Amino acid sequence: RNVMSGTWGELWLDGNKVAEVKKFQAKMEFTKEDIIIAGQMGTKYMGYKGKGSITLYHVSSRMHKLIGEKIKRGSEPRFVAISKLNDPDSYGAERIAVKNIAFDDLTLADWEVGVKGEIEAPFTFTEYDFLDII
């Protein structure tokens, strides 16, 4: 409905291709904190928090090291997913880039399960772009 979803694609950590994507679903949410800002006297758009689930496979053997380097630098890792949209005609686009993705609960062992198997994880995101316009 107001939920976006997609199937095949790729997951990236900066310039590194780190997994393939089987599917995703995402929803945008109005929070009370966003409601306060939009009501400020002194200004028709509103901030939003993105949340979803994504299913990953063919995880890179380099994920362990890439995450360790993020921790060393002090930077929580932020990803990009590219995926084939469901119902592309409704969007006027065939693919989506879901950006600034955070995985609050994915562990090193979860990444491990996704090398030879598949892993479904919740995620948050803050922006997106439509790709392959039609």
Author numbering: 7 to 49, 52 to 142
Task: Quote the paper.
The R-type diffocin tube protein CD1364 crystallized in space group P43212 containing one molecule in the asymmetric unit. CD1364 possesses a compact fold with a central β-barrel flanked by two α-helices at both of its open sides. Whereas α-helices α2 and α4 cap the β-barrel on one side, the α-helices at the other protrude away from the β-barrel such that α1 covers the β-barrel of a symmetry-related neighbor. Higher B-factors indicate increased flexibility for α1, which hints at structural changes that may occur during tube assembly. As was suspected from the molecular replacement process, CD1364 shares highest structural and sequence similarity with XkdM from B. subtilis as well as with gp104 from the bacteriophage φ812 tail tube, and the overall fold for these proteins is mainly preserved. Notably, in XkdM, α1 does not protrude away from the core of the structure such as in the crystal structure of CD1364 discussed here, but rather caps the β-barrel of the same molecule, again suggesting a high degree of flexibility for this region in both CD1364 and XkdM. Particularly, a prominent loop (K33–G58 in CD1364) is variable and folds into a flexible α-helix in CD1364 (α1), XkdM from B. subtilis and HCP1 from the T6SS of B. pseudomallei, whereas these residues form a protruding β-hairpin in FIIR2 as well as in gp19 from bacteriophage T4. Notably, in the tube protein CD1364, α1, which interacts with a neighboring molecule in the crystal structure, sticks out of the calculated envelope. Comparison reveals that the architecture of the central β-barrel mainly remains unaltered in the assembled tube whereas positions of α-helices α2, α3, and α4 are significantly changed.
A rather recently identified group of PTLBs are the R-type “diffocins” from Clostridium difficile, which constitute the only Gram-positive R-type PTLBs known to date. All R-type PTLBs consist of an inner needle-like rigid tube surrounded by a contractile sheath. Binding triggers extensive conformational changes in the baseplate, accompanied by contraction of the sheath, which, due to extensive interactions, drives the rigid inner tube into the cell envelope. Here, we have determined the crystal structures and SAXS envelopes of the R-type diffocin tube and sheath protein CD1364 and CD1363 in their pre-assembled monomeric state.
